[PDB]
From a paper:
Diabodies are among the smallest of these bispecific antibodies. They are constructed by connecting heavy-chain variable fragments (VH) and light-chain variable fragments (VL) with short “GGGGS” peptide linkers. Therefore, the two VH-linker-VL chains associate to form a dimer with two antigen binding sites, each consisting of the VH and VL fragments from the different chains. In order to investigate the structural flexibility of the Fv interfaces of diabodies, we have determined the crystal structures of 10 mono- and bi-specific diabodies with and without bound antigens.
In monospecific diabodies, two identical VH-VL protein chains form a homo dimer. In order to confirm this, we determined the structures of six additional monospecific- and bi-specific diabodies with amino acid substitutions at position 83. We determined the structures of three monospecific and three bispecific diabodies by substituting the arginine at position 83 with other amino acids. Note that the diabodies we used had substantial sequential diversity in their C”D and EF loops. The second Fv domains of all the diabodies are clustered in a small area, demonstrating that substitution of the positively charged arginine greatly reduces the structural diversity of diabodies. In conclusion, we have found that substitution of the positively charged arginine in the EF loop greatly reduces the ambiguity in predicting diabody structure.
Residue numbers in the entry:
A (entry chain K): 124 to 229
B (entry chain L): 1 to 123
């Protein structure tokens, strides 16, 4: 299994600021098959980023993902108040899909 | 484009449930479909995958031999047959369209809650 380790577990920041979230894989993620999801309380996950750096339709430019091999990062250049949620990373690059533990952004 | 789960509810350990996911707004038969669950207050955990028919299927180690995924393309419907439920299975179950290189899990249903509980006694 490809273990996805996310840090920090929790971050507290102010509106306007930059959130930098890490997702480290225990092994190279083939084809950059790595996605990010936003999840607000009571709601279903929402795709933000796939293929490491591809922004999903309707996702604001302030969200951008990057990285390759084992080190990935989601950057929210300037936080809006609605941006506060849990963020999961996800590798679809083998036959046992796995997720990170999530990062809560306050 | 939309998925709608159903079939969740409260059951006691050892019981069984069959969940349903009704797809619309896309060519169902050409999508791989997955179930992903979330225990209350916990992270996302992938449960099961099916291909176009395929019939190739894949299961997380925790549900192997108890759960069975299937699809009926003529009904635009994905299914999860949950046998031998245990407390640890308690979670919201989401169905998702897996678009791979074309979007990962780009479409999610609203989820359906499965609670497996004897009610606290008999521990």
């Amino acid at each position: 299994d490809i273990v996805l380790t996310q840090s920090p577990a929790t971050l507290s920041l102010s509106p306007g600021e930059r959130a930098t979230l890490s997702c480290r894989a225990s092994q190279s993620v083939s084809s950059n098959y790595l996605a990010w999801y936003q999840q607000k309380p009571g709601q279903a996950p929402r795709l933000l980023i796939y293929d490491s750096s591809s922004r999903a339709t309707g996702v604001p430019a302030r969200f951008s993902g990057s990285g390759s091999g084992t080190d990935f990062t989601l950057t929210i250049s300037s936080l809006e108040p609605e941006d506060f949620a849990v963020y999961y990373c996800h590798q679809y690059s083998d036959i046992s899909p796995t997720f990170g533990q999530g990062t809560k952004v306050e | 484009v939309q998925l709608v789960e159903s079939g969740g509810g409260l059951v006691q350990p050892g019981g069984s449930l069959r969940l349903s996911c009704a797809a619309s707004g896309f060519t169902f038969r050409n999508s791989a479909m997955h179930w992903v669950r979330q225990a209350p207050g916990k992270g996302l955990e992938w449960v099961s995958s099916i291909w176009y028919s395929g019939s190739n299927t894949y299961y997380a180690d925790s549900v192997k031999g108890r759960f069975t995924i299937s699809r009926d393309n003529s009904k635009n419907t994905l299914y999860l047959q949950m046998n031998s439920l245990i407390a640890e299975d308690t979670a919201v179950y989401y169905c998702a369209r897996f678009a791979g290189g074309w979007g990962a899990y780009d479409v999610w249903g609203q989820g359906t809650l499965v609670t497996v509980s004897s009610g606290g006694g008999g521990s």
